[PDB]
Ligand binder design. Structure first.
Ligand SMILES: Nc1ncnc2c1ncn2[C@@H]1O[C@H](CO)[C@@H](O)[C@H]1O
Ligand SMILES: [Cl-]
Ligand SMILES: [Mg+2]
Length: 346
C-alpha cells in the first residue's frame, strides 16, 4: 500500500449507467441531453434504475481525477481521497468499487442521508444526467485527516467542495502551505463557483500553487476579480492576470501556475518561476477522429488527473499538460468515467 503521492477532497458520487427507452425519460420529466439535480419526484429514479442492472462506477469530479492518478501510478494506495457518503447501501457499493481500484479512501458517513448518486441515462446516442448530491454537502474533514494523508506532497480540491464549506479546502491548503515541498492545487469547477465564492477564493488562491480551469470559468474569474478567450492574446492576458491572484505580485519562489484548457484550442498556461519571472506555455491538443468521440463528460477531470500524475513524476509543465491531454483524449471514447490498465497513456 502506498506511498500516497496525491490526496484530494471532493463530493463522491455513484454513477449508474444504463440504456433506457424514451418513455423512461418522460416518466421522470427529464429532457434528453440535459444534466440536472433531482427534484423530489425524481428521487424514485435511483431504485427504479437499479432494476436495469446498471453499470456502477465511482463518480464525482475530484474522485474521477484521483482515479486517473491511481490508475497511472499503478501501485495500490498511491492516491487518497476524502468525502462524505450516507450510511445507505449505495455508500457501501461506492466504497467497495473504490477499494477494487486500489484507491485509498476515507469516507465520512452522514447517518440518515443518501450517498451522492447520478443516473446516467443513455438514449438516442445522448446522455441525460440526474444527480442527487445527498451527503456530499455535509462533509467536514476529521481532526486527524493529515494522518491519512501520510507523506503526500500534492493536494487537490475542486471548487465544488466549497458548497459543503470552504473550510475543508482552506484547511487542506493551509496544511500544504506549512510544507515547503508540498503544493495545493485547485479547480475552478464551474462559473457559479467562481461567482458564489468570490471572497473565499480570493483568500484560497493566495494559498494555491496550481489553478486549473476552462475558458468560461476563467472568463468569469477575470470579470469577478477585474483581472482584465478563443483569441490567444486575450487568453494569455486572462491567465497572466489570474496568476496575480496566486502571487499577489510577490515571489515566494514556490510553484505558481495557472492552466487554462480551451476545448479544441491549445492549452494556455502562465507560470512564475522561483526566479520571479512570468512564462507563458502553449500546448496543442492532439485530435481524435470524430468517429471515436463517444462521451465528452469527464474530459476535464481526466485532464487534471493526468496532469497531477505527470507532476508527481517530476515532468515539465508542458509534459504535464501533454499527459493531461492524452488522458482526456482516452476517456471520451466510452460512456462513463473509467479507464483500463491496458494501453494507458503518459
Ligand atoms: N458538484 C459536484 N461535485 C462532485 N461530483 C460532481 C458534482 N456534479 C457532478 N458531479 C459528478 O461528476 C461528473 C462530471 O465530472 C458528473 O457526471 C457527476 O457524476
Ligand atoms: Cl468534486
Ligand atoms: Mg507548500
Amino acid at each position: 500500500t502506498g506511498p500516497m503521492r496525491v490526496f484530494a477532497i471532493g463530493n463522491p458520487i455513484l454513477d449508474l449507467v444504463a440504456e433506457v427507452p424514451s418513455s423512461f425519460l418522460d416518466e421522470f420529466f427529464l429532457k434528453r441531453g440535459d444534466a440536472t439535480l433531482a427534484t423530489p419526484e425524481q428521487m424514485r429514479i435511483y431504485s427504479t434504475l437499479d432494476q436495469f442492472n446498471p453499470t456502477s462506477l465511482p463518480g464525482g469530479s475530484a474522485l474521477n481525477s484521483v482515479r486517473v492518478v491511481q490508475k497511472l501510478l499503478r501501485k495500490p494506495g498511491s492516491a487518497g481521497y476524502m468525502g462524505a457518503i450516507g450510511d445507505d447501501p449505495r455508500g457501501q457499493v461506492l466504497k467497495e468499487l473504490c477499494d477494487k481500484e486500489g484507491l485509498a479512501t476515507r469516507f465520512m458517513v452522514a447517518p440518515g442521508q443518501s450517498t451522492g448518486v447520478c443516473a446516467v441515462l443513455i438514449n438516442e446516442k445522448e446522455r441525460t444526467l440526474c444527480t442527487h448530491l445527498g451527503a456530499c454537502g455535509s462533509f467536514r474533514l476529521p481532526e486527524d485527516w493529515t494522518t491519512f494523508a501520510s507523506g503526500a506532497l500534492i493536494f487537490y480540491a475542486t471548487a465544488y467542495t466549497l458548497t459543503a464549506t470552504p473550510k475543508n479546502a482552506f484547511e487542506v491548503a493551509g496544511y500544504a502551505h506549512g510544507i515547503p515541498n508540498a503544493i495545493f492545487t485547485l479547480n475552478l469547477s464551474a462559473p457559479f463557483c467562481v461567482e458564489l465564492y468570490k471572497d473565499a477564493m480570493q483568500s484560497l488562491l493566495l494559498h494555491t500553487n496550481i489553478l486549473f480551469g476552462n475558458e468560461e470559468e476563467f472568463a468569469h474569474l477575470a470579470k469577478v476579480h477585474n483581472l482584465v478567450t478563443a483569441n490567444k492574446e486575450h487568453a494569455v492576458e486572462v491567465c497572466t492576470g489570474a496568476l496575480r491572484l496566486l502571487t499577489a505580485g510577490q515571489n515566494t519562489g514556490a510553484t505558481k501556475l495557472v492552466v487554462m484548457t480551451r476545448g479544441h484550442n491549445p492549452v494556455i498556461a502562465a507560470e512564475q518561476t522561483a526566479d520571479g519571472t512570468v512564462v507563458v506555455h502553449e500546448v496543442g491538443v492532439p485530435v481524435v477522429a470524430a468517429e471515436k468521440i463517444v462521451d465528452t463528460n469527464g474530459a476535464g477531470d481526466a485532464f487534471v488527473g493526468g496532469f497531477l500524475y505527470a507532476l508527481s513524476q517530476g515532468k515539465t509543465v508542458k509534459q504535464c499538460i501533454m499527459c493531461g491531454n492524452a488522458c482526456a483524449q482516452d476517456v471520451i471514447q466510452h460512456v462513463g468515467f473509467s479507464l483500463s490498465f491496458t494501453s494507458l497513456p503518459c
